[PDB]
Amino acid sequence: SEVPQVVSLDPTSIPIEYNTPIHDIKVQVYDIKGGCNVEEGLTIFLVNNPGKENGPVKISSKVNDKQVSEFLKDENMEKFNVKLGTSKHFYMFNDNKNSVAVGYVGCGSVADLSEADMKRVVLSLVTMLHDNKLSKLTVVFEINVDKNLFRFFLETLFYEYMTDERFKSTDKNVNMEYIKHLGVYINNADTYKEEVEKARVYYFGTYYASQLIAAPSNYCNPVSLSNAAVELAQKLNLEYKILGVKELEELKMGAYLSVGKGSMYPNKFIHLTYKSKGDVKKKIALVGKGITFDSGGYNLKAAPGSMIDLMKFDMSGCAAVLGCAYCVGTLKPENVEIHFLSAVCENMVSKNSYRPGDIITASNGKTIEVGNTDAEGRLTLADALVYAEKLGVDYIVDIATLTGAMLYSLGTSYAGVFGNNEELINKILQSSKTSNEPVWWLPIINEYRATLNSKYADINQISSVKASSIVASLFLKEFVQNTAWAHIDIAGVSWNFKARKPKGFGVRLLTEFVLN
Amino acid sequence: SEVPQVVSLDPTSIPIEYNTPIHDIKVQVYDIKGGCNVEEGLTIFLVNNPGKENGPVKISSKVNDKQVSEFLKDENMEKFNVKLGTSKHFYMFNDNKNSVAVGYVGCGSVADLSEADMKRVVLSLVTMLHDNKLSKLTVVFEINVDKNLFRFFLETLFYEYMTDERFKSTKNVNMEYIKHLGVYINNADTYKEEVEKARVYYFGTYYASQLIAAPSNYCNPVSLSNAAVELAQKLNLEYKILGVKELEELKMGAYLSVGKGSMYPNKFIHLTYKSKGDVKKKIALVGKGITFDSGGYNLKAAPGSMIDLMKFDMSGCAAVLGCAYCVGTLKPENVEIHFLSAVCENMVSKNSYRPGDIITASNGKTIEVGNTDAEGRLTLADALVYAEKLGVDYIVDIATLTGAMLYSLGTSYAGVFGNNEELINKILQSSKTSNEPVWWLPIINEYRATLNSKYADINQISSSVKASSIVASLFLKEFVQNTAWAHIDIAGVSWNFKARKPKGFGVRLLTEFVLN
Amino acid sequence: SEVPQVVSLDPTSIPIEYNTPIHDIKVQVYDIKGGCNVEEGLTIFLVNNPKENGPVKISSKVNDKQVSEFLKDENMEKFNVKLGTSKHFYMFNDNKNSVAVGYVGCGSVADLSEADMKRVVLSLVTMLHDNKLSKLTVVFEINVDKNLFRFFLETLFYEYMTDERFKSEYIKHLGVYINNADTYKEEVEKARVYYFGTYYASQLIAAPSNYCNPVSLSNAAVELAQKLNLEYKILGVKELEELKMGAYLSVGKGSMYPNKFIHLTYKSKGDVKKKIALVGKGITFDSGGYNLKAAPGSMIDLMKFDMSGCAAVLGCAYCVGTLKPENVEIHFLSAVCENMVSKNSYRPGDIITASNGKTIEVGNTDAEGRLTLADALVYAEKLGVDYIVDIATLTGAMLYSLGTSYAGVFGNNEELINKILQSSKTSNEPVWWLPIINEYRATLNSKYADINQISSSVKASSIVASLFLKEFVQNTAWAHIDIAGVSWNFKARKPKGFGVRLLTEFVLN
Ligand SMILES: CC(C)(C)C(=O)N[C@@H](C(=O)NO)c1ccc(-c2cccc(/C(N)=N/O)c2)cc1
Ligand SMILES: CC(C)(C)C(=O)N[C@@H](C(=O)NO)c1ccc(-c2cccc(/C(N)=N/O)c2)cc1
Ligand SMILES: CC(C)(C)C(=O)N[C@@H](C(=O)NO)c1ccc(-c2cccc(/C(N)=N/O)c2)cc1
Ligand SMILES: [Zn+2]
Ligand SMILES: [Zn+2]
Ligand SMILES: [Zn+2]
Ligand SMILES: [Zn+2]
Ligand SMILES: [Zn+2]
Ligand SMILES: [Zn+2]
Structure with a gap:
């Protein structure tokens, strides 16, 4: 149990973070048939366009905001395409004359996303999360995903979002600020809710292993x-x-x-x-x-x-x-x-x-x-x-x-x-x-x-x-x-x-x- | 303070020679506008010939000895050239019917000797000091050198002349360093201050050399x-x-x-x-x-x-x-x-x-x-x-x-x-x-x-x-x-x-x- | 003069593009004094913070109320000025016209080196390559001399351009806001010449x-x-x-x-x-x-x-x-x-x-x-x-x-x-x-x-x-x-x- 040292400056334990900012994120899953509330934070639509090699963006989900719905009309959205990994940010005012941030991530033209494709999608999402001081992220699933792929989305999101600073001293990121809320809008919401906490467990199991490996x-x-x-x-x-x-x-x-x-x-x-x-x-x-x-x-x-x-x-x-x-x-x-x-x-x-x-x-x-x-x-x-x-x-x-x-x-x-x-x-x-x-x-x-x-x-x-x-x-x-x-x-x-x-x-x- | 050893034969200190034979060399600087006397040891003229590639050697300096002056007449010296690094040895009898040794070192055609060329000049000189059991070296400067280059000459002479034998056991049995060094040069009084400064600079360099060379x-x-x-x-x-x-x-x-x-x-x-x-x-x-x-x-x-x-x-x-x-x-x-x-x-x-x-x-x-x-x-x-x-x-x-x-x-x-x-x-x-x-x-x-x-x-x-x-x-x-x-x-x-x-x-x- | 061939399929000349899309770009330089117009296209602010990865703050006056609201300190402080970092958003201006607004971070050093400016430009070019824009507007809220300004344009043009000679929608307008604009205008057409000289050389080198x-x-x-x-x-x-x-x-x-x-x-x-x-x-x-x-x-x-x-x-x-x-x-x-x-x-x-x-x-x-x-x-x-x-x-x-x-x-x-x-x-x-x-x-x-x-x-x-x-x-x-x-x-x-x-x-x- 006692770690031997050559000098007194030699570390005698592996620094381990058990309580991560990811664990502090309140996650809610809503049914997409009930419409989306676009209030605070950043709201991202995962959209594709089948049989179309970089097809136009079309938001199918019903949005419970007249102003946001108007911004998201097809005529407005047609200037953007669904190329896998592509993302855009939108700025607008909602029904309460409050400034809101909206965007999307392109999910390509294939109806069945591979493990590599979803990871590419997730990575684009995290880029939007990085260098932005958001308090809430909302993800609207306008694509088809089963329970396993949905869980994979969350695991990958949590893992890539998280940043390991155990060995930083004078170079800690001064701008790091994790979201506190995660909202997910999806079809068949009841079936996916059990996957949320399982994803959080799988996340930490992976990140814990990551912490041990990354440790010198x-x-x-x-x-x-x-x-x-x-x-x-x-x-x-x-x-x-x-x-x-x-x-x-x-x-x-x-x-x-x-x-x-x-x-x-x-x-x-x-x-x-x-x-x-x-x-x-x-x-x-x-x-x-x-x-x-x-x-x-x-x-x-x-x-x-x-x-x-x-x-x-x-x-x-x-x-x-x-x-x-x-x-x-x-x-x-x-x-x-x-x-x-x-x-x-x-x-x-x-x-x-x-x-x-x-x-x-x-x-x-x-x-x-x-x-x-x-x-x-x-x-x-x-x-x-x-x-x-x-x-x-x-x-x-x-x-x-x-x-x-x-x-x-x-x-x-x-x-x-x-x-x-x-x-x-x-x-x-x-x-x-x-x-x-x-x-x-x-x-x-x-x-x-x-x-x-x-x-x-x-x-x-x-x-x-x-x-x-x-x-x-x-x-x-x-x-x-x-x-x-x-x-x-x-x-x-x-x-x-x-x-x-x-x-x-x-x-x-x-x-x-x-x-x- | 105490050096650890693996075996008792492992050395416990760096052998350092502080008093080098170089320190025992009595150095005298004379003004050339009084003429040179060639009595014992080796007398070397540093000679050049500007703008004339490998031109003849000509001794400008006055020599206070009639036979040596006659020996050194221009007609006799014209068979030799001033190519950088060239050195020659002469044997003759002076006014006191005593055998004397005279020679020169070629200093090229360039009026301004470089740090590298001067180093070449010194090495040619040191070669004459090697394999010869002289009691005195006399160097006559018939070239143009400022105070710094003159100091550089002495340092390089001292450093290259010195031989590190701290780790020899078997050691050269035929080594015999000079006890006197004479230098004839114009404006000698200005150059006298450089002598002991060069000696200090010499040992600082040689001391460092000793530490580095030490295994x-x-x-x-x-x-x-x-x-x-x-x-x-x-x-x-x-x-x-x-x-x-x-x-x-x-x-x-x-x-x-x-x-x-x-x-x-x-x-x-x-x-x-x-x-x-x-x-x-x-x-x-x-x-x-x-x-x-x-x-x-x-x-x-x-x-x-x-x-x-x-x-x-x-x-x-x-x-x-x-x-x-x-x-x-x-x-x-x-x-x-x-x-x-x-x-x-x-x-x-x-x-x-x-x-x-x-x-x-x-x-x-x-x-x-x-x-x-x-x-x-x-x-x-x-x-x-x-x-x-x-x-x-x-x-x-x-x-x-x-x-x-x-x-x-x-x-x-x-x-x-x-x-x-x-x-x-x-x-x-x-x-x-x-x-x-x-x-x-x-x-x-x-x-x-x-x-x-x-x-x-x-x-x-x-x-x-x-x-x-x-x-x-x-x-x-x-x-x-x-x-x-x-x-x-x-x-x-x-x-x-x-x-x-x-x-x-x-x-x-x-x-x-x-x-x- | 005649190029020798081993087989008939061997090429006998270097394909060279003389008329590039860059040459079709209308460049306008305005003085930053008097406010910036955010009408069409994409508007990018070059911003720094003299601290280390400090918040974004937009100094320039914008002659658009909707965009001005976007660029308020409360909104922009959520972003930092780390060199090369960029964000751009799409929104409607006062005329309900679609516009894109953003920035490129220029660090904390007041004097950008040629390497620093290169990173800024590369960040800019990434947005140009992924957006179907007709116009780019660049607002200089940093200190740049005539030589470095010319360098900015040259590098922008060079990096923007894509060599497709061996493969088998560029902007049409460039707007620049900068203090003392009149002094910088002469550098524009010089930059276009320097651009092609560099790009021409690039074409010969890149050619197999x-x-x-x-x-x-x-x-x-x-x-x-x-x-x-x-x-x-x-x-x-x-x-x-x-x-x-x-x-x-x-x-x-x-x-x-x-x-x-x-x-x-x-x-x-x-x-x-x-x-x-x-x-x-x-x-x-x-x-x-x-x-x-x-x-x-x-x-x-x-x-x-x-x-x-x-x-x-x-x-x-x-x-x-x-x-x-x-x-x-x-x-x-x-x-x-x-x-x-x-x-x-x-x-x-x-x-x-x-x-x-x-x-x-x-x-x-x-x-x-x-x-x-x-x-x-x-x-x-x-x-x-x-x-x-x-x-x-x-x-x-x-x-x-x-x-x-x-x-x-x-x-x-x-x-x-x-x-x-x-x-x-x-x-x-x-x-x-x-x-x-x-x-x-x-x-x-x-x-x-x-x-x-x-x-x-x-x-x-x-x-x-x-x-x-x-x-x-x-x-x-x-x-x-x-x-x-x-x-x-x-x-x-x-x-x-x-x-x-x-x-x-x-x-x-
Ligand atoms: C048979 C051999 C000794 C060559 C071997 O397979 N050695 C492995 C080893 O050290 N086992 O204890 C070995 C060697 C290299 C790697 C390895 C793993 C990941 C990346 C790389 C890599 N980038 N090499 O350039 C090399 C992994 C295992
Ligand atoms: C980063 C690297 C390992 C390339 C390096 O800088 N190494 C130096 C080093 O070990 N610093 O502690 C290094 C490497 C080689 C030399 C060196 C110096 C002088 C001669 C030679 C030489 N002739 N090697 O064959 C090699 C000096 C420093
Ligand atoms: C004297 C020597 C043959 C070593 C040399 O300098 N040759 C150059 C040459 O081929 N002249 O005709 C030479 C060698 C290597 C390079 C070079 C340039 C850029 C990259 C690399 C390299 N080895 N990248 O991995 C090598 C450039 C010039
Ligand atoms: Zn091994
Ligand atoms: Zn191993
Ligand atoms: Zn080393
Ligand atoms: Zn080393
Ligand atoms: Zn070569
Ligand atoms: Zn070559």
Whole structure:
């Protein structure tokens, strides 16, 4: 629990914001058939024009204001088009001779907005929210969205609107001012109301993960991350257990302990459990990779474009699992028992570091020949997967920033999923659809298994077969003997390079998985 | 004060030679309008021939010896030319039937010798001093030189003549420095004052050279700071060495972070010279003091990164200390100078700061580390804050900051940056009179936006923009709020790659700045 | 004159747009005193706050009650003045006519730099590209001098314009409100000329190497010369051989396009008191030769820009031919060719002879610019001029010294250098003086030839290259502008047309 320091100026905890301005926003949903009141703040219409490549803007909704309705007549609106992402601001006086602000966001010509399309729409909305000191936002849905896409709209809105200033000091934005009210006008309003607070939970689960990932390695270390996990568990009334080095040695986790040998921070194994109130029909282990910093070890990340300054992300999997723990602990699903696992450590260069060539013994007895110290994720997961299977669960799902090869296979939008079981894989893909976090199924090619045959050990850590994501999956598979297991590689999608911030990818995916 | 050791064979101090053979050379300046007597040792004429490429050598000076005068008749000398760097040796008997040695050095056809050509002249002269066991050197100036260039001649003569053998064991058994130096020149009385000034300037440069040439196992933060104290005590300068505890109390998080991975504690050097009368100008001299730059986790592993030379990375501190010698010795009036250096070592360890880390400077600004090898500006940041807190008129820092300097100005000219044109003008003026060439480079504000960090107040390094020297200057500028400041990047000029030794660059420049 | 083809589908000319939509824009300048009329179109206020990202406050009186209500302090303080930040709203004015009103933030500094003004303009152009307006009205509530005001217009015109020559609704009126408007009006038509000179250069640079080759580029120079009544002469291989331009001819040996030396001349009507030669590097594509640009990050796909010096000179020729300066004779020169890999290419190690008799040992075929410039400078000095100014994308080292914003200037004459620096100030194309360090000269000493092409190296490539060029100007005031870093706008993925206005201001002032 006590974080070691080199100097007294070294931080000893991760700064975490639990009460965000988003949580202070009163959200109301009204039915669009009842007409819209356009009074205070900014009122935005989400409008499209089917079969028309940049068609004219037409406001269909009834507006309970003669002056605003007059401004919004088609003859007035025809100068504007519905091109996806396009937005405009309107200034006018309402029936009470009060100044009001009105506008729209273009939703293109396609009647079915993709996950990318809605995100593009949301981003345009946030630009209107930025650099403007509004007290209220009102969104009028003149497009067709189902419950899932509606929830996605809110989640994405909350997440992008929120700004992380935990590490700002002399450069805090002096103009930041969050809205206090959110009004939503939509068709079939009663069906969508339940999605509001679920979206708020999914938001924070994601933002919490984001906070952990964005936190630098001097703030976010194996000890401070594990302390934060306990703190979260206490708040959610979850059972929790943090395994220290002596306990890990007792469990003979030689692979996990080897990676952390060169670190000044002791290894900390996070084990959280949520158990439903009643009959448990499904037991699930969620495993997250928890490398608080990946220097690469003695296989140092020194090659051009290895982005070592980014390697604080290497605990993104752990964050996804912890963010899911928040959502599950808050929404409290029934008939499920969930274990949240993460073998947390740091991969550093030291006199005490494990070397390339070292042979290490996993907790299941298998000896492993280390061919590359920068492939440390699969080593820590190996011991974690063995621990997971001993819990006696039905499904083991691990999520990890495992291989850079994902950038060349799926890129920055789609995570890849591997597994030994098609049913579990199908559930993950189903969860991908409903959570709107895109995942693609990649194969575990058994023909490559022979490249992991070590001359001296039971198995090689790496091949020496480019195909890194597949080989890594073959490695991990060796540590699950008779349990349905799935592996999600998020090395490519975890970090948003365009926005220079984490995505908190996987939180919504895993929560949808546990709930459904 | 006590230097830590790994083994008992690790050195515990920097070997320093204070009394050099150069100091034992008796120097006499005579007026040439009285004629030259050629008796013992070597007598060298510095001769040119204006507007006539490689024209004949002609000795204009009167020689108070009939045979030598006859030997040196124009008819005899016409077979030799005045090409720059050319030297010749003559053997003859004087009026007392004694064997004497005479020769010349060609000084070209240009009437105004450059700083570079004069250096070539000196080297040709020093070559004659080498491999010859002379008791006296006599130099006759038959060229036109002002007081500054004459002083430059002596400094360069002294510095190049001197040989550093502190680390020889086996040492040249055949070395034998002269005990007397005679100079014949017109208006000798005006030039006599330059002799002891040159000797002071010489050692300031050679002292700096000794610190730079000293390897990092000899020259470490503790041993270097100890040396500064010892120097300060000999000069009666006020001195204060700030240790880790004061630095923590002063909240120097940037400086302390760089040294975290080192076995040697950070040591902040603070020397002060105060005049006896009224103080009209207060000056802070800041030197980069990285005793070894491994690059940290951004290891210098790239081809041609020249990590074995990186003991020079404390050249700025050495330059400042060399200046402290000159100022403390010459004792200028009406000035108060603070000699500063945030000394530490940039190493790879379990305790090292990582890429991505956010650290807080002593002025409260948070800094996101994008590259651990850009450590100089971090130590300078806290040092510059400390300097401004002293309430001075001018802040000048000198540092081996950016490798880009080799591509901009190369190895002869250092670059100067600043926030104040007047100060820049003073630095440039000092460059002329000290003959240490410096060129003014711009701080381009358009690049400042690339230092915008998403999470911290500022980025340590840029991403988009090359031109590191300007970007680094933009960084440093953020740590000086309302004081005239200039920054001299000597990364390119500090080491003499051809001669394989330091130049001690900056000592004479800074002293002239302080004196004038 | 005839462009050679490999297949019949290969283009034989550079598509050039002479009549741009910008030329159809009616520009009106009114004095800010007396109030602003908000009638049609979009009205944008340029506002600052002398604090850091302070609230927007509109000082100007607006002769419209509805718009005045919009611009009241209570409404505008919700917005801040962060440089580049903008908001615009659509509303009805007193005449129930649709109008759009907004601002662009100009920061807290009272004196906007050229880079600052560029960010303001870019924010403005984004609104012009996303709005179907017939009229733009810009209200200057900031301090701008005549030069910077002209710069505003030029940059606005340039950024507004879109190059669609290779693809397979602009405003018609521009209103400007500014204090002391009468003093600023003369800058308007000057800006329009400077605009096209820059845009013309941009068109040549942006044109790919299959369109823009030595033949088609020289043809373009003739066509321009004919429109401007400039004297013109294009030297072909046979003339160049008789002139013994061996350095220049060696570089082009490996190309399928014959070398073409462009020589345009502007001569004043009255007495010629000053003669100036402008030399531009004209490499239509730089593959690097046998020293191929194959290293990671060598950006070989960008190397069509390597004729930017020539384009700058030609764009300047337009401005000079249009504005018609007095008492000057200007020669516009470019040794145009292509640096390719072939059985006929010159090899690393080859010793070649320049037109002044100097033999040169080639150490790197990718340092071809200085070879073509060498013969061009000899040709220039033979004309008997007062000033020789060359402009070239010469060394990549400029990216490490001054970066992408400031060009570097080198020279053998201090008066000429300051004139260029003065021109840099008034044209707002930033240039910084870099030294020609004579101590590095010895590194060009060849064992076999008279001189080395490159050092081996004294890293500082930009300085070493200047020393090389310096050897080919014997008794003439000469200056060299390295634009390798500033020529291409990597962020916007387009040329800057850098140097046209700089060179024009030099000739005019
Ligand atoms: C097989 C290899 C050691 C190359 C590997 O896959 N290493 C991963 C690792 O460090 N596991 O612990 C690895 C390497 C790179 C990345 C990664 C992730 C995201 C972005 C990038 C990136 N931008 N590289 O330029 C690189 C992720 C995982
Ligand atoms: C931002 C960057 C890492 C490029 C940088 O400025 N590095 C300097 C540094 O480590 N500061 O602490 C840096 C890099 C190289 C040099 C340097 C200086 C002198 C010679 C050489 C050289 N010849 N390397 O092969 C390299 C000096 C400073
Ligand atoms: C002496 C050397 C071959 C290194 C050189 O300066 N070559 C220049 C050249 O090709 N002259 O004909 C040269 C090299 C690189 C560049 C340049 C310009 C802009 C960008 C880049 C680059 N590498 N972007 O990633 C490189 C410009 C001129
Ligand atoms: Zn790794
Ligand atoms: Zn990893
Ligand atoms: Zn460094
Ligand atoms: Zn350094
Ligand atoms: Zn080239
Ligand atoms: Zn080129």
